Design an enzyme around this catalytic site. Structure first.
Site, PDB file in Angstrom:
ATOM      1  N   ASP A  34       0.813  -1.234   0.000  1.00 49.32           N
ATOM      2  CA  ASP A  34       0.000   0.000   0.000  1.00 49.32           C
ATOM      3  C   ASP A  34       0.834   1.266   0.000  1.00 49.32           C
ATOM      4  OD1 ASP A  34      -1.956   1.999   0.386  1.00 49.32           O
ATOM      5  OD2 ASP A  34      -2.004   1.661   2.559  1.00 49.32           O
ATOM      6  N   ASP A 219      -1.604   5.630  -5.386  1.00 45.25           N
ATOM      7  CA  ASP A 219      -1.992   4.688  -4.315  1.00 45.25           C
ATOM      8  C   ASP A 219      -2.310   3.257  -4.782  1.00 45.25           C
ATOM      9  OD1 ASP A 219      -2.979   3.360  -2.053  1.00 45.25           O
ATOM     10  OD2 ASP A 219      -4.728   4.650  -1.886  1.00 45.25           O
TER      11      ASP A 219
HETATM   12  C1  LIG Z   1     -10.012   2.002   2.092  1.00 47.20           C
HETATM   13  N1  LIG Z   1      -8.757   1.416   1.554  1.00 47.20           N
HETATM   14  C2  LIG Z   1      -8.066   2.074   0.625  1.00 47.20           C
HETATM   15  O1  LIG Z   1      -6.991   1.653   0.183  1.00 47.20           O
HETATM   16  C3  LIG Z   1      -8.507   3.459   0.241  1.00 47.20           C
HETATM   17  C4  LIG Z   1      -7.309   4.352   0.674  1.00 47.20           C
HETATM   18  C5  LIG Z   1      -6.410   3.762   1.821  1.00 47.20           C
HETATM   19  C6  LIG Z   1      -6.962   3.771   3.112  1.00 47.20           C
HETATM   20  C7  LIG Z   1      -6.240   3.279   4.198  1.00 47.20           C
HETATM   21  C8  LIG Z   1      -6.787   3.295   5.488  1.00 47.20           C
HETATM   22  C9  LIG Z   1      -6.038   2.794   6.564  1.00 47.20           C
HETATM   23  C10 LIG Z   1      -4.754   2.287   6.356  1.00 47.20           C
HETATM   24  C11 LIG Z   1      -4.227   2.278   5.067  1.00 47.20           C
HETATM   25  C12 LIG Z   1      -4.953   2.773   3.992  1.00 47.20           C
HETATM   26  N2  LIG Z   1      -4.425   2.759   2.763  1.00 47.20           N
HETATM   27  C13 LIG Z   1      -5.096   3.231   1.695  1.00 47.20           C
HETATM   28  N3  LIG Z   1      -4.457   3.162   0.525  1.00 47.20           N
HETATM   29  C14 LIG Z   1      -8.068   0.202   2.015  1.00 47.20           C
HETATM   30  C15 LIG Z   1      -7.842   0.194   3.530  1.00 47.20           C
HETATM   31  C16 LIG Z   1      -6.596  -0.669   3.783  1.00 47.20           C
HETATM   32  C17 LIG Z   1      -6.637  -2.017   3.008  1.00 47.20           C
HETATM   33  C18 LIG Z   1      -7.302  -2.004   1.600  1.00 47.20           C
HETATM   34  C19 LIG Z   1      -8.568  -1.139   1.536  1.00 47.20           C
END
Ligand SMILES: CN(C(=O)CCc1cc2ccccc2nc1N)C1CCCCC1
EC number: 3.4.23.46
Length: 369
Positions: A34, A219
């Site tokens: 991520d 991202d």
């Molecule tokens: C909503 N999700 C997104 O990726 C949208 C943007 C994003 C939000 C996050 C929230 C908390 C921690 C890392 C994060 N990393 C991201 N890239 C994810 C959450 C983590 C696992 C996959 C689904």
């Protein structure tokens, strides 16, 4: 770099993960790659959706930092305990490092029922690391504690999805043509400035500051091309127009309905290419990356999702953009580079491109302050 080629796996919509090991003896986990966040964070409790989880009681090299972390987000949270242990990446550089690790001990709408990953790897910068920037992100620790160069690149190929994360360099076999670089505007997320948007070689013609309001980032953790609000409907409006060779309901473009075709034939042509111009390395210079409709119309497991969607948080160039291209996160040089991917899906008529240079004035004025 062959050892690291094809070191990523996943499922449609469920993210990309690399194999990692934690602690002594090593405990293998699938960790989600991520670039949208900065924490290395892994399941430590037997949640029912987890295949495996970090058992700190088995690791002689585990060390409690005696501090907790709380990470709320829009529709979910994760929460856990800070510590350090020894981390290694089997299909990656041949090293082992002591990194910060968040033992996740309570979460809501964090783990995906079905998925095959048990933690997250925050690849971005200390500034957005929870709880604060003193919590050194994994990648910072890797470069500091070995001679591994300060860069990584990602080739997301996209039931089974695959790709490569090349830690420490760039594998030329993974892309065609030439890398073009855009500067990392600030070191928190991988922030970049979009200076111009075309849909069918036809400028959207919007004040460019709209495109990066309040943020434009790269991202791996997001799926969609998410656009800002104004921009979004404006693109929709233009996309909607170039696609007048047929009608669909309002809820579809709004990401509330699926849209169905016959598994006999894929149409495609009646859909516009999308071009994004990104600030170049030089004053008044830019380049453009170009996605096909295959990139933004995504089959659901014959109805596709329109994988462009709106946002409150800014622009997010997710897998939609990223599976078009080899993406190089050249952190040494504060820049992100884009090349046409070797593994991307293309018909005979059109193709994903990275082209430059172009002339674009007042590019710094497209940023937000
Ligand atoms: C909503 N999700 C997104 O990726 C949208 C943007 C994003 C939000 C996050 C929230 C908390 C921690 C890392 C994060 N990393 C991201 N890239 C994810 C959450 C983590 C696992 C996959 C689904």
């Amino acid at each position: 770099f062959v050892e690291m080629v094809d070191n990523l796996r996943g499922k449609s919509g469920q993210g990309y993960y690399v194999e990692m090991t934690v602690g002594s003896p090593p405990q293998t986990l699938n960790i989600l790659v991520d670039t949208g966040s900065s924490n290395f964070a892994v399941g430590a409790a037997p949640h029912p959706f987890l295949h495996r989880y970090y058992q700190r009681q088995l690791s002689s090299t585990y060390r409690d930092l005696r501090k907790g972390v709380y990470v709320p987000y829009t529709q979910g949270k994760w929460e856990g305990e800070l510590g350090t242990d020894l981390v290694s990446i089997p299909h990656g550089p041949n090293v082992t490092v002591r990194a910060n690790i968040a033992a996740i001990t309570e979460s809501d709408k964090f783990f995906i029922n079905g998925s095959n990953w048990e933690g997250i790897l925050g690849l971005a910068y200390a500034e957005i690391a929870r709880p604060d920037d003193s919590l050194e992100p994994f990648f910072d620790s890797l470069v500091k504690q070995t001679h591994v160069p300060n860069l990584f690149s990602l080739q997301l190929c996209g039931a089974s999805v695959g790709g490569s994360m090349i830690i420490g360099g760039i594998d030329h076999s993974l892309y065609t043509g030439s890398l073009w670089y855009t500067p990392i505007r600030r070191e928190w997320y991988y922030e970049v400035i979009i200076v111009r948007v075309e849909i069918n070689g036809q400028d959207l013609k919007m004040d460019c500051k709209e495109y990066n309001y309040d943020k434009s980032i790269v991202d791996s953790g997001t799926t969609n091309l998410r656009l800002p609000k104004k921009v979004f409907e404006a693109a929709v409006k233009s996309i909607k127009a170039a696609s007048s060779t047929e009608k669909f309901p309002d809820g579809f473009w709004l990401g509330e309905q699926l849209v169905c075709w016959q598994a006999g034939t894929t149409p495609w042509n009646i859909f516009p290419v999308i071009s994004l111009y990104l600030m170049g390395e030089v004053t008044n210079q830019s380049f453009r990356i170009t996605i096909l409709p295959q990139q933004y119309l995504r089959p659901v497991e014959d109805c596709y999702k329109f994988a462009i969607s709106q946002s409150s948080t800014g622009t997010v160039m997710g897998a939609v953009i990223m599976e078009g291209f080899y993406v190089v996160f050249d952190r040494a040089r504060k820049r992100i580079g884009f090349a046409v991917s070797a593994c991307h899906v293309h018909d005979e008529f059109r193709t994903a491109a990275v082209e430059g240079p172009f002339v674009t004035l007042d590019m710094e004025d497209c940023g937000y302050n």
